[PDB]
């Protein structure tokens, strides 16, 4: 019902879509494709994480769910950024 929550939810879904594509292509050794999807995923993760979600009005199961989505997104953003830098610098094992 709050518009800030749907932004978080949309970012969560899109980020997963692109990071999953990135991981699929990465596992298949398609490193240029992977970097592409990872960068798109980063954009969505950043947006979802950027939404203020600890204010006074931010109460209830919806906001709680949104915060947990952002928790997940911050963790994944760290992992994607690491893998991206590794691929960009050609250090993939």
């Amino acid at each position: 019902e709050p518009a800030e929550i749907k932004i978080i939810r949309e970012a969560y879904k899109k980020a997963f879509l692109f990071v999953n594509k990135g991981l699929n292509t990465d596992e298949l050794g398609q490193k240029e494709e992977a970097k592409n999807y990872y960068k798109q995923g980063i954009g969505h993760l950043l947006r979802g994480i950027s939404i203020s979600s600890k204010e006074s009005e931010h109460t209830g199961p919806g906001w709680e769910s949104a915060r947990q989505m952002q928790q997940k997104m911050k963790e994944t953003l760290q992992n994607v950024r690491t893998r991206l830098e590794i691929l960009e610098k050609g250090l993939a094992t």
Binding site: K13, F16, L23, E27, K72, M73, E75, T76, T93
Partner: peptide, 16 residues
């Protein structure tokens, strides 16, 4: 059935 935890697992595996 979106599971971000599964993503983390796959990144860890790519390091091996």
């Amino acid at each position: 059935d979106i599971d971000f935890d599964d993503l983390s697992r796959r990144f860890e595996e790519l390091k091996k």
